[PDB]
Structure formats: C-alpha cells, structure tokens
Design a protein around this ligand. Structure first.
Ligand SMILES: Nc1ncnc2c1ncn2[C@@H]1O[C@H](COP(=O)(O)OP(=O)(O)OP(=O)(O)O)[C@@H](O)[C@H]1O
Ligand SMILES: Nc1ncnc2c1ncn2[C@@H]1O[C@H](COP(=O)(O)OP(=O)(O)OP(=O)(O)O)[C@@H](O)[C@H]1O
Ligand SMILES: [Mg+2]
Ligand SMILES: [Mg+2]
Lengths: 23, 570
C-alpha cells in the first residue's frame, strides 16, 4: 500500500467593505 | 539530453542589452570554464528572466541554449510533480544531481513560480518541501561541481513576486525583459519575416510606429495575420474551382464545398506580402495588453464635428499632433503627455469632440463612464485606478477619457467621504507623481469644472481647460449642415432654419433634436398622404424632410439649457 498525495479544499477568508452615509 | 538546434540566435531579436549580459553571465561560466579555473573561482551563476508574458523569455532561453552547445536540461514546473509521497521531491533532486554529473550544464526552470511559490502563504507540506528542495538543489551545484565546470540555472517567470524570497535571492542576476521599444520592434519584425518572401516595399519603420503596445509575441501574430492575407486570394481561387464544379448563405457554402474536396488538394501559388496587407494585419491583431480594459475606438470623425474650430485646433496641437509625430514635438521641448479638461454646458459637443480625437489620433483608447472605477471593497477602488494607468502606460500612446469626471475627482473637503477621497489622491499620484506616465493622454469632460479637485486641474495632470460653449449663429449653420449631411432640402434651407430667431439659445443637442423633430414631421406628412392615396387607390411615397417639415420642428423644439451662465462661469 502506497499513500499518494491528494489535494483538498481551501479555507475561507474575510473581506472589508465600505458603506456610504447619507448624513 | 542535448539541446535541439531548432531555435536559432537569429530567431530572437530586439534584445541586445540582455544578450550582452548573458555573454558574460551565461556563456562565460559555461563556455569559459578554463578562465574561471585559472583563479580557482567557482563561477556558478543563476540568472532569472522576468517580464511581461510574451517578451520572448522562453525563446531567449532556448536561443542561448542552442548557441552554447553545452548540455541543456529544460525543466517545466508541472513535470516534476509525482503522485507518490516522496516522488515529487525526488524528481527535483535528480534534476540537480544530473546537472552536476553533466557539468558544465544549463538548467532552465521555465515557469518556476508554479512550483517555487511562497511557502509562507501556501501552507501545505508537498508545496513547502518542493521549495526547500530547490534551495538545497541550487546549493549543491555551487559545491559538488569540479570547480572548472560551472552549472548555470536559468529560470523564467512572468510572476516574479510569487517566488519565495529565500529562492529568489539564489538567482544572482535578474533580467527584466520589458516590452520592446520602437527600435526593437523593427528588429523583431525583420527576424520574424527573414524566411518569408516580402514585396521589397515593406517599411518596417512605419510598422514599428503603428504597433505602440506590442510585445514580441504580439508581433508574431501580425506577421501571422499578414501571411493569411496573402493566401486569402488563393482560397477564393480554390472556392471558384469548387463553386463552378457543382450547380445557406455564402460562408456556409464555402465550408461545405471545401468539405467535398477533402481528399483532393490544389497547390497554392507562392505570393509576396505587400505593405497594404501588413497595414491591414495590424488592425486585425489586438495586442496581448489590449485584450481587456480597452474601449472600442469611436466611429466619430471630424466630418461629424461641425464648428468648434478653436477646440479642434487645441486638440490637434495637444493630442493628435504629438501622437502622430512625436519627433517634432520632442525637439521644441514638449513632454509626450497632455491633460485636457473639456467643460461647458451639456449638449455642446464635449463627448463628441473627445470621441473624434480618440478616432483621428489612431491611438489606443480607454473610456471611463463617470464613477465606473468605484468598488465596495476597501482597496479595490484605488487598485482599479492604479491598474488603469498601468495599462495606459504599457500601451502608450493611449488616450484616457473621463466622461463626466466630476463624479470621480470631487473636490477634497472635510465633508467629503473618505472612500471617495482616496480615489482622488490615487489619481493625483498616477497623473503626476514619482512614476511619470509619459505617453498617456488624459481627456476629461464635465459640466461642473468647479467641482473637480484643484490639485487635478493643474498643469501636468489636466493642464488646459477648453471651454465648449453654445454655438453662435454662424456656428449653428455649420452644425446643422453637419448633422443633416451625416444623416442622409438642399443647403439653402438648412441655413434659413439654423439662422432663424426661434433657434436662439439652441445647443448642439437641440439642433440634433430639431432634425429629429423635422423627420417626425416628415413621417406625419407621409402617413396622412399615404392613407389618402391608399384608400382612394401599392402605396409608398418617398420620406424626405421638406422645408415645410422644418417649420413644424421650429415651433416644437425648445432649448434645453435654460441658464447657460450657470454653466458658462466657473
Ligand atoms: N524578441 C523576440 N524576437 C523574436 N521573436 C520573439 C521575440 N519575443 C517573442 N517572440 C516570439 O513570441 C513567441 C515567444 O513565446 P515564449 O514562450 O517565449 O513567450 P514568453 O515571452 O516567454 O512569455 P511567457 O514567459 O509568458 O511564456 C515566439 O513565437 C517567438 O518567436
Ligand atoms: N459641434 C457639433 N457638431 C456636431 N454635432 C454636434 C455638435 N455639438 C453637439 N452635437 C450633437 O449633439 C450631441 C451631443 O453629444 P455630447 O455627448 O458631446 O454632448 P455634450 O456636449 O458632451 O453634453 P453633456 O454634458 O450632456 O455630455 C452629439 O452627439 C451630436 O449629435
Ligand atoms: Mg514564453
Ligand atoms: Mg455629451
């Protein structure tokens, strides 16, 4: 039995946003 | 494993400083082995080639790999990946072990960024152990070789920032093969066409001038496209033999007739490539840098622009002039960069005259639709502006047109939003900062020039403000004739319509509306008369704008700019 290298899923990240103000 | 002699040093052109360096940093370590052994010096060198994709990095490596004649080991990053746990790292180890065993040798790690990416970001185990294996492999070369037989490692990548800093430092020489200059593009065309039959009238000086944003790979397509023009006429003669052989539009028949004669071939006569084909090939080929982000050239020409002689002279002296013949403007001391701010009341031709300049200058064109670059994320709006000027600089000369620019560069005050104040400051550095943008011509169009930041409206960013105001009585005659003749009454009636006192205060947009209201009056006249003949006895009269139709439009269309002084000042 030989263990092969297997690729997997990726992590999730965070994203900053900018919000306008009518005042 | 000897390097095939299929790519020649003549196949690479336009790079001479690079070939001058490689003569002492690649040729000398590998071919001048005895000279290094006299001093007892291990001259094991590592050269990294980086630049835009298509700048002949792979061909340069293969060109100099056949010009030396030493053992060459072409390595592609995906080829050293295996399915077993330790096979992937063993393959890289065997590459450098074989190179040392075959010293002097030349290793070419093409697309090294595929396997040598940052291990401080790509937190895996195979990927990190591949990077560590290359460092160990590149250090065994410096020590395990018999002194006098050096090994040079060549690496080519168009993303040198993805390399691990611990691996990028192991390449002593980095060569930046940028986009070819005007002199370099002439040499590349000669080296691409040296085996073709040219019509002896090819002016490569003109070809280099008409390819502002091309790289070595892009110029190959122009030669490739020009070749197909010469053989276009040899396929029509082939279709004639097929069309007349037999008794669904025309293109579909061609694909079917040629399918029938699939087992039969007709020899193509040899033909030369004329200068017209080359000039036609350049238009058909879009540069790799121009694939995305560039607007289509407007169809507006100077025949569409009436009056505005003062504006036309300024735009020809400021933009069209330096673009077409930069040599003349360089002698007098004019920088190859202009900033024009077109402003005035709406409908008077600001966008129209800036679309003719983009078309008459025959340069690359990027159009921005107001606040088109703004993004909701923190850094993506300033990044779009920086990328906007990166494309324009890479494809100079280029015309950047900001339509309704007051929404992109509002005057910086305390009450201004922080997100919209960063875009203004980003544009301040791109237009005139540490990195000069020579070859980028900026045109701005707005109705509110006073709402534009005062730092933008300075020489070097938008030096000149051209006021495009309401036409005069004499100008309205030229505009109305221009609008009419570009859309099809004679000219004597157009003069009477345009000089009428009812057209007082009409702008350029109102004259275009006046012609539309005259055409609508024509259709009503056509409609009523068509029914009367049709019902009374197969009925179609010619729709033509008569002088009676112009009378209805004059009593129907009113000016739109109610207070020009509100836009005439400031
Ligand atoms: N200076 C040049 N002289 C002649 N031909 C060139 C030159 N630069 C590029 N070419 C042509 O363009 C192509 C170069 O392909 P190549 O694989 O070298 O791309 P590249 O410049 O290395 O970009 P990448 O590194 O992204 O692959 C070839 O067809 C080559 O003939
Ligand atoms: N000098 C002119 N010659 C020919 N047509 C003109 C002229 N001025 C205006 N027009 C007509 O009016 C239209 C107005 O186009 P344009 O986008 O330039 O308006 P504008 O003057 O920039 O006003 P806005 O501030 O609303 O953009 C033109 O497309 C053309 O149909
Ligand atoms: Mg390449
Ligand atoms: Mg307009």
């Amino acid at each position: 039995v030989v263990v092969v290298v297997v690729v997997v899923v990726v992590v999730v990240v965070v994203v900053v946003v900018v919000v306008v103000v009518v005042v | 494993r000897t390097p095939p002699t299929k790519v020649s040093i003549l196949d690479i052109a336009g790079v001479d400083d690079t070939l001058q360096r490689l003569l002492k940093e690649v040729w000398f370590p590998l071919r001048g082995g005895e000279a290094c052994e006299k001093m007892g010096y291990r001259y094991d060198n590592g050269v990294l080639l980086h630049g835009p994709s298509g700048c002949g990095k792979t061909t340069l490596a293969h060109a100099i790999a056949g010009s030396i004649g030493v053992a060459f080991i072409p390595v592609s990053a995906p080829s050293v990946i295996g399915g077993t746990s330790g096979e992937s790292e063993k393959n890289i180890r065997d590459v450098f072990d074989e190179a040392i065993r075959l010293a002097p040798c030349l290793i070419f790690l093409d697309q090294i960024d595929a396997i040598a990416g940052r291990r401080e970001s790509a937190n895996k185990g195979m990927e990190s152990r591949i990077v560590a294996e290359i460092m160990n492999g590149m250090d065994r070369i410096r020590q395990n070789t018999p002194l006098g037989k050096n090994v040079v490692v060549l690496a080519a990548t168009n993303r040198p920032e993805f390399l691990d800093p611990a691996i990028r430092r192991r390449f002593s020489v980095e060569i930046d093969m940028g986009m070819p200059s005007e002199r370099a593009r002439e040499q590349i065309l000669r080296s691409l066409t040296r085996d073709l039959s040219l019509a002896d009238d090819i002016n490569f000086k003109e070809l280099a001038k008409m390819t502002p944003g091309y790289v070595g790979s892009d110029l190959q397509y122009v030669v490739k496209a020009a070749v197909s023009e010469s053989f276009q006429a040899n396929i029509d003669s082939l279709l004639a033999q097929a069309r007349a052989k037999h008794p669904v539009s025309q293109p579909q028949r061609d694909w079917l007739l040629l399918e029938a004669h699939r087992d039969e071939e007709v020899s193509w006569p040899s033909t030369k490539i004329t200068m017209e084909q080359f000039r036609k090939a350049v238009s058909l080929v879009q540069p790799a840098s121009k694939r995305e982000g560039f607007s289509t050239i407007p169809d507006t020409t100077w025949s569409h622009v009436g009056a505005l002689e003062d504006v036309r002279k300024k735009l020809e002296m400021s933009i069209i002039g330096p673009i077409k013949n930069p040599e003349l403007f360089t002698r007098v001391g004019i920088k190859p960069a202009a900033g024009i701010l077109l402003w005035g009341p709406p409908g008077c031709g600001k966008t129209l005259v800036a679309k003719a300049v983009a078309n008459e200058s025959k340069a690359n064109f990027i159009s921005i639709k107001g606040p088109e670059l703004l993004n909701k994320y923190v850094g993506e709006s300033e990044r779009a502006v920086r990328q906007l000027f990166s494309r324009a600089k890479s494809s100079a000369p280029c015309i950047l047109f900001f339509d309704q620019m007051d929404a992109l560069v509002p005057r910086r005050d305390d009450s201004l939003s922080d997100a919209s104040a960063r875009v203004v400051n980003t544009l301040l550095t791109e237009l005139d900062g540490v990195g000069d943008r020579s070859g980028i011509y900026v045109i701005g169009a707005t109705n509110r020039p006073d709402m534009i930041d005062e730092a933008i409206r300075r020489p070097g960013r938008l030096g000149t403000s051209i006021y495009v105001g309401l036409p005069s009585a004499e100008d309205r005659v030229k505009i109305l004739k221009t609008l009419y003749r570009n859309t099809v009454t004679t000219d004597a009636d157009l003069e009477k319509v345009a000089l009428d006192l009812r057209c007082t205060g009409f702008s350029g947009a109102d004259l275009g509306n006046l012609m539309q209201a005259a055409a609508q009056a024509c259709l009503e006249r056509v409609y009523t008369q068509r029914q009367q003949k049709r019902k009374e006895g197969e009925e179609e009269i010619e729709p033509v704008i008569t002088m009676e139709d112009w009378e209805k439009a004059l009593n129907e269309v009113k000016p739109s700019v109610k207070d020009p002084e509100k836009y005439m000042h400031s």
